[PDB]
Amino acid sequence: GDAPGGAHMTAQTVTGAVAAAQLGATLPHEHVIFGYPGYAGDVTLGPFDHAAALASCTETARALLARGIQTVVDATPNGCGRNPAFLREVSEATGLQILCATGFYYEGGGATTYFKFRASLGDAESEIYEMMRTEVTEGIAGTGIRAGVIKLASSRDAITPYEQLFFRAAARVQRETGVPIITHTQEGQQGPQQAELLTSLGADPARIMIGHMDGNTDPAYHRETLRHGVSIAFDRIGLQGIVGTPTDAERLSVLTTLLGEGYADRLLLSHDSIWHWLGRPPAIPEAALPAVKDWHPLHISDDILPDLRRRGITEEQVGQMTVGNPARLFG
Amino acid sequence: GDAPGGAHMTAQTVTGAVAAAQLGATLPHEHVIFGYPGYAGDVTLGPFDHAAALASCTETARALLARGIQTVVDATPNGCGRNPAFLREVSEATGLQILCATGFYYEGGGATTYFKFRASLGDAESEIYEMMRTEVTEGIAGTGIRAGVIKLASSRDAITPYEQLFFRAAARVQRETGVPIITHTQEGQQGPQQAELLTSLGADPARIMIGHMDGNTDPAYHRETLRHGVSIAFDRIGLQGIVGTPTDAERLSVLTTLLGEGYADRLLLSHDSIWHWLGRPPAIPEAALPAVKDWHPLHISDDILPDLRRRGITEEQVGQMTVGNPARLFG
Ligand SMILES: [Co+2]
Ligand SMILES: [Co+2]
Ligand SMILES: [Co+2]
Ligand SMILES: [Co+2]
Numbered sequence A, B: 001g002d003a004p005g006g007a008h009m010t011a012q013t014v015t016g017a018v019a020a021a022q023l024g025a026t027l028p029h030e031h032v033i034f035g036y037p038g039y040a041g042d043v044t045l046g047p048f049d050h051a052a053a054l055a056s057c058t059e060t061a062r063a064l065l066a067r068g069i070q071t072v073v074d075a076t077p078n079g080c081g082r083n084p085a086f087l088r089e090v091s092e093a094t095g096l097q098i099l100c101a102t103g104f105y106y107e108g109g110g111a112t113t114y115f116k117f118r119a120s121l122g123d124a125e126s127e128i129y130e131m132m133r134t135e136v137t138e139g140i141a142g143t144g145i146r147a148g149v150i151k152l153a154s155s156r157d158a159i160t161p162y163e164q165l166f167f168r169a170a171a172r173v174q175r176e177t178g179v180p181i182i183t184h185t186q187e188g189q190q191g192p193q194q195a196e197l198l199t200s201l202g203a204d205p206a207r208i209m210i211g212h213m214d215g216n217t218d219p220a221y222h223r224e225t226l227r228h229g230v231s232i233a234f235d236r237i238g239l240q241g242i243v244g245t246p247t248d249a250e251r252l253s254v255l256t257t258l259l260g261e262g263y264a265d266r267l268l269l270s271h272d273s274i275w276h277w278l279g280r281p282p283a284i285p286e287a288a289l290p291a292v293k294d295w296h297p298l299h300i301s302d303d304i305l306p307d308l309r310r311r312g313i314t315e316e317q318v319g320q321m322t323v324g325n326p327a328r329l330f331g
Helices: A050-066 A084-094 A113-121 A124-137 A161-177 A191-200 A219-226 A248-260 A286-292 A299-310 A315-330 B050-066 B084-094 B113-121 B124-137 B161-177 B191-200 B219-226 B248-260 B286-292 B299-310 B315-330
Strands: A011-013 A016-018 A025-034 A069-074 A097-099 A149-153 A181-184 A208-210 A231-234 A267-269 A274-277 B011-013 B016-018 B025-034 B069-074 B097-099 B149-153 B181-184 B208-210 B231-234 B267-269 B274-277
Touching: A011 A097, A025 A050, A025 A084, A025 A267, A025 A315, A050 A069, A050 A084, A050 A274, A069 A315, A084 A097, A113 A124, A113 A161, A124 A161, A149 A161, A161 A191, A191 A208, A191 A219, A219 A231, A219 A248, A231 A248, A248 A267, A248 A299, A267 A315, A299 A315, B011 B097, B025 B050, B025 B084, B025 B267, B025 B315, B050 B069, B050 B084, B050 B274, B069 B315, B084 B097, B113 B124, B113 B161, B124 B161, B149 B161, B161 B191, B191 B208, B191 B219, B219 B231, B219 B248, B231 B248, B248 B267, B248 B299, B267 B315, B299 B315
Parallel strands: A025 A069, A025 A274, A069 A097, A149 A181, A181 A208, A208 A231, A231 A267, B025 B069, B025 B274, B069 B097, B149 B181, B181 B208, B208 B231, B231 B267
Antiparallel strands: A011 A016, B011 B016
């Protein structure tokens, strides 16, 4: 099929290099810990309880392994609580393999002030390129822990000029190292534009996963994106009818259509769940309880897969999505 | 004149309570360390060199004392690098008294994602109120170091709904504790609106300093703001013709007019300087060199004051601005 072509390094997890064959079933987009930009400024009342986060996270890790999930890809942006050392902790404690990311979030929800300022003063793209390259090849913050993927994100109405700085830096790092790229699309838009842009810049589509594609329910939009040869992920499975999100029933309808059209090799599945929130614990209005009810990392293993199988999807298609595709994209 | 009326606590500096009479000459708006939101996500290439920052900061501290400045008010927002423990370090090492702030920055340049999200889920104002109240009365991040002022900020075109959450929480904390409030106005606008809003909410104008008023060169705008009984600060003195900023000559023209109209008791002067930047050191395009040439904390002491005196301003007016006003506002 379409194999990764160009520079290449074996999958880097927070605990070191891992062979593609050892990745096993994988959730390509989750967040062990996560905090929206600003969470740190609420440190007095919402401090990080490391002991509790570690207990809870490892328990979630252990439950994933119970389900045969050997690997999780943590997509947390550098300014949203990324903590490679903590992920290494969670990994060494449970045996769950974790890959972390390098990247900043979309303009609308990221810690954008910094690079927007540096971009006004000089060559920010080049500076973003050096950070990503260093994090992928040498390590994050002096820990030696390397990023196994680059995380890119765009806004709803366009991939903004600020966002494009990151897309150009990542493309260059991609070309030079072969590292995988995973993305965020805001509210079901810009999937095709991200794929076009990344490929146009020389990024290997065999190493690109356009995310939150489940955010759009017109399969035409998905096919237009797949036309580029990149993989696409229904990665907010379980987050229903909230923040623009469709219902899982809607996602499944699109998914089985795409599956029935032969796209298994290019479909990945995830929850975009957060195991432990940073800042003060989120206050969940009762009315939103159903929207987040299945939004946890065991939902696909326990509800989705069995539901695709009973719908006609095959053990082979499911293994392609959950093991085949990840092995090739990140391995 | 107009003395602080209501609840009251003695000036809290990062090293403890200080009598109003011991504040001495003060710079009401500076930043020992500062980083635009996102700086932390650039930690791999732009890590904090604590030894160098401490050496440099204390040297700046020592130079301020050489000039008789006994106190500095650090206006750094919770998500812009605020570090009470480091300020205590700089203070205990030199004897320079430092007050730190509690508050988030304006929507356009702050770490806004967090509270914008919490506001969508619940009562963020109340949450912001608890943080500010706890930081002012008990301490920041478990250090015991209390905030001596609340920092509020608004955008250019309006005090946005997100910003108003902070203005309402601060007003309440102001009413209950008497703590001073200092603000940021973006590009010479919203000074009058901030003053109106804060007073309308029950905040004591004798404890309110509307900042970056030097950003507007129409004295009419300043008088309209002073009409509220609040103090106003020309606090970006030295930052010239850049980021919308006027020249110092322009600021001085407005200042002597206001001074000649009897407003000394309500005028404060500062630089809004940054002693040590967080993130990778700022790259200064040569063309901007003159704009930042006098932008350091010795500029007012060495250039401005002597320049107001030779312009006719009196030793008494200068002492009112630099010692009288601070004593009353923060003491
Ligand atoms: Co996302
Ligand atoms: Co995510
Ligand atoms: Co400001
Ligand atoms: Co400032």
